[PDB]
Scaffold this active site. Structure first.
Site, PDB file in Angstrom:
ATOM      1  N   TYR A  32     -36.610  32.433  -6.208  1.00 52.66           N
ATOM      2  CA  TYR A  32     -36.079  32.218  -7.745  1.00 52.66           C
ATOM      3  C   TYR A  32     -36.218  33.737  -8.429  1.00 52.66           C
ATOM      4  O   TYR A  32     -37.077  34.629  -7.983  1.00 52.66           O
ATOM      5  CB  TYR A  32     -37.097  31.369  -8.232  1.00 52.66           C
ATOM      6  CG  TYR A  32     -36.895  30.061  -7.523  1.00 52.66           C
ATOM      7  CD1 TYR A  32     -36.043  29.168  -8.125  1.00 52.66           C
ATOM      8  CD2 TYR A  32     -37.901  29.547  -6.622  1.00 52.66           C
ATOM      9  CE1 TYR A  32     -36.147  27.789  -7.491  1.00 52.66           C
ATOM     10  CE2 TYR A  32     -38.000  28.127  -6.222  1.00 52.66           C
ATOM     11  CZ  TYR A  32     -37.006  27.283  -6.524  1.00 52.66           C
ATOM     12  OH  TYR A  32     -37.102  26.097  -5.877  1.00 52.66           O
ATOM     13  N   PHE A  70     -36.285  38.174 -17.110  1.00 49.98           N
ATOM     14  CA  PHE A  70     -37.581  38.053 -17.438  1.00 49.98           C
ATOM     15  C   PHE A  70     -38.192  39.052 -16.329  1.00 49.98           C
ATOM     16  O   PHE A  70     -39.150  39.729 -16.784  1.00 49.98           O
ATOM     17  CB  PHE A  70     -38.163  36.522 -17.392  1.00 49.98           C
ATOM     18  CG  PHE A  70     -39.499  36.311 -17.538  1.00 49.98           C
ATOM     19  CD1 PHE A  70     -39.922  36.358 -18.707  1.00 49.98           C
ATOM     20  CD2 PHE A  70     -40.473  36.062 -16.464  1.00 49.98           C
ATOM     21  CE1 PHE A  70     -41.676  36.321 -18.935  1.00 49.98           C
ATOM     22  CE2 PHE A  70     -41.694  35.768 -16.543  1.00 49.98           C
ATOM     23  CZ  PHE A  70     -42.249  36.086 -17.477  1.00 49.98           C
ATOM     24  N   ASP A  71     -37.975  38.667 -15.108  1.00 54.33           N
ATOM     25  CA  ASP A  71     -38.413  39.420 -13.977  1.00 54.33           C
ATOM     26  C   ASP A  71     -37.707  39.561 -12.812  1.00 54.33           C
ATOM     27  O   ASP A  71     -37.334  38.243 -12.445  1.00 54.33           O
ATOM     28  CB  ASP A  71     -40.039  39.266 -13.865  1.00 54.33           C
ATOM     29  CG  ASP A  71     -40.486  39.763 -12.599  1.00 54.33           C
ATOM     30  OD1 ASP A  71     -41.043  40.879 -12.493  1.00 54.33           O
ATOM     31  OD2 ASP A  71     -40.533  39.209 -11.260  1.00 54.33           O
ATOM     32  N   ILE A  85     -39.473  20.724 -10.071  1.00 55.59           N
ATOM     33  CA  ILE A  85     -38.755  20.042 -11.107  1.00 55.59           C
ATOM     34  C   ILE A  85     -37.394  19.763 -10.331  1.00 55.59           C
ATOM     35  O   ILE A  85     -37.067  20.376  -9.686  1.00 55.59           O
ATOM     36  CB  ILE A  85     -38.566  20.578 -12.474  1.00 55.59           C
ATOM     37  CG1 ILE A  85     -37.840  21.956 -12.469  1.00 55.59           C
ATOM     38  CG2 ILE A  85     -39.918  20.861 -13.090  1.00 55.59           C
ATOM     39  CD1 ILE A  85     -37.332  22.526 -13.607  1.00 55.59           C
ATOM     40  N   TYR A 129     -40.952  23.930 -18.309  1.00 55.28           N
ATOM     41  CA  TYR A 129     -41.995  23.981 -19.170  1.00 55.28           C
ATOM     42  C   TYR A 129     -41.419  24.728 -20.465  1.00 55.28           C
ATOM     43  O   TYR A 129     -42.113  24.847 -21.529  1.00 55.28           O
ATOM     44  CB  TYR A 129     -43.089  25.013 -18.418  1.00 55.28           C
ATOM     45  CG  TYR A 129     -42.510  26.464 -18.019  1.00 55.28           C
ATOM     46  CD1 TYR A 129     -41.839  26.473 -16.811  1.00 55.28           C
ATOM     47  CD2 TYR A 129     -42.631  27.510 -19.071  1.00 55.28           C
ATOM     48  CE1 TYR A 129     -41.311  27.717 -16.479  1.00 55.28           C
ATOM     49  CE2 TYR A 129     -41.955  28.698 -18.519  1.00 55.28           C
ATOM     50  CZ  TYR A 129     -41.570  28.954 -17.296  1.00 55.28           C
ATOM     51  OH  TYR A 129     -41.290  30.073 -17.032  1.00 55.28           O
ATOM     52  N   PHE A 158     -32.893  30.200 -14.109  1.00 55.19           N
ATOM     53  CA  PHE A 158     -33.474  30.535 -13.085  1.00 55.19           C
ATOM     54  C   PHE A 158     -32.460  30.994 -11.973  1.00 55.19           C
ATOM     55  O   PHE A 158     -31.622  29.776 -11.608  1.00 55.19           O
ATOM     56  CB  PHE A 158     -34.331  29.467 -12.409  1.00 55.19           C
ATOM     57  CG  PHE A 158     -35.802  29.493 -13.403  1.00 55.19           C
ATOM     58  CD1 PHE A 158     -36.686  30.259 -13.148  1.00 55.19           C
ATOM     59  CD2 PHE A 158     -35.796  28.673 -14.414  1.00 55.19           C
ATOM     60  CE1 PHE A 158     -38.011  30.335 -14.036  1.00 55.19           C
ATOM     61  CE2 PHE A 158     -36.866  28.220 -15.290  1.00 55.19           C
ATOM     62  CZ  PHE A 158     -38.036  29.460 -15.146  1.00 55.19           C
TER      63      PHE A 158
END
Length: 130
Positions: free
Chosen positions: A50, A60-61, A80, A106, A123
């Site tokens: 991911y 994000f990273d 999920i 989340y 993602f």
């Protein structure tokens, strides 16, 4: 003569500007297509990967740079339903940009100040193998 003067100038009415309507948003844009002949099936332990990314585009990273492949039983409650569906709908050797709505992840709760509560988070899902 009508030559459509098209130009992304601005937005007079933003209507809460963002990735779209503030609800269950789901866009899937493949970064790297896979075999296509390969078929991921439930019940089996699959090898995935991911990347956390904002709908803006800014990542994000790059967890891809970490070269860490995760493994979980497809169809199980390991992750999920969003990620389950992501890996279930993709193919082997493939990676796609899968938009995860805040309500499923989340992103609703936020947790860190990096993620503003009720934030839809993207993602990149990557299926290395099963």
């Amino acid at each position: 003569m009508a030559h459509h003067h098209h130009h992304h100038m601005g937005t007079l009415e933003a209507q809460t500007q963002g990735p779209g309507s503030m609800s269950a948003q789901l866009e899937k844009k493949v970064l790297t297509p896979g075999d296509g002949v390969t078929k991921p099936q439930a019940g089996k332990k699959v090898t995935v990967h991911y990347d956390g990314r904002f709908p803006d585009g800014k990542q994000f990273d790059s967890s891809r740079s970490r070269g860490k492949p995760f493994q979980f039983t497809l169809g199980a409650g390991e992750v999920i339903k969003g990620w389950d569906q992501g890996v279930a709908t993709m193919t082997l050797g493939e990676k796609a940009l899968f938009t995860i709505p805040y309500q499923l992840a989340y992103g609703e709760r936020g947790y860190p100040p990096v993620i503003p509560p009720k934030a839809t988070l993207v993602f990149e899902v990557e299926l290395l193998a099963v």
